[PDB]
Amino acid sequence: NKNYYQLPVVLLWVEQVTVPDYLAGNGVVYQTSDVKYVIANNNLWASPLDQQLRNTLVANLSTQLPGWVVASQPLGSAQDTLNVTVTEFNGRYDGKVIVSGEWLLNHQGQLIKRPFRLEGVQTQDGYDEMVKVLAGVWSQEAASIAQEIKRLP
């Protein structure tokens, strides 16, 4: 059978999330060696990964930022903007999942650029658990971004 996977979806405009080509295909990515990434043929994203990363980012930030309106749509001219590149979002042969990239926040004219690289541990086999753990780590990255925002005026 074919299986499809979704990162669960639980002023600030999350303008865009970019992924490179190898993460932009239909299949979920598994790193089988130190050099090789494989796109699954029968275990696919239920919608393109950059869209899922963007939507889950909006929802996770919304739960992390009470008093804020976080959206994937423009909200107002004075809004903060958040642009994210995700360069790694995959499982790995050693049971780990890797989530890394860089975000760029424009908060009232201040540009804040922060790299991120986080790891999770897959306690069960299968693409089910891999996607679960990746979603959890992505939510941790949203919490980190919201913590930086709450330290701003």
Residue matched to tokens 């540009």:
111
Question: What's the CA gap between 129 and 103, in Å, rounded?
Answer: 26
**How far apart, in Å, are the Cα atoms of 151 and each of 10, 126, 137?**
24, 39, 22
Question: What's the CA gap between 14 and 4, in Å, rounded?
Answer: 25
132: its two tokens: 């679960």
Q: Which residues pair with 91 in a beta bridge?
A: 30, 97
DSSP 94-142: TSEEEEEEEEEEEETTEEEEEEEEEEEE--S-SHHHHHHHHHHHHHHHH
Question: What's the CA gap between 39 and 62, in Å, rounded?
Answer: 31
Q: What is the 3-state secondary structure (H, E, C) of 20-89?
A: CHHHCCCEEEEECCCCCEEEEEEEEECCCHHHHHHHHHHHHHHHHCCCCCEECCCCCCCCEEEEEEEEEE
* Method by which the model was determined: X-ray
Residue matched to tokens 């959890």:
136
**How far apart, in Å, are the Cα atoms of 92 and each of 36, 84, 147?**
10, 22, 28
State the DSSP H helix or E strand holding residue 148, giving kind and residue range, or none if neither. Answer: helix 127-150
**How far apart, in Å, are the Cα atoms of 96 and each of 5, 44, 137, 148?**
18, 19, 11, 26
CB 93 within 8 A of CB 33: yes
| CA contacts within 13 A on the Cβ side of 88 | 19
What's the chain's length in residues? Answer: 153
90: its two tokens: 């995959």
Provide the Cα torsion 104, 102, 39, 90; round to 10°.
Answer: -130
Domains annotated for the chain, with CATH where assigned, are: 3-150 (3.40.50.10610)
CB 58 within 8 A of CB 50: no
Please count the other Cβ atoms lying within 10 Å of the Cβ belonging to residue 80.
20
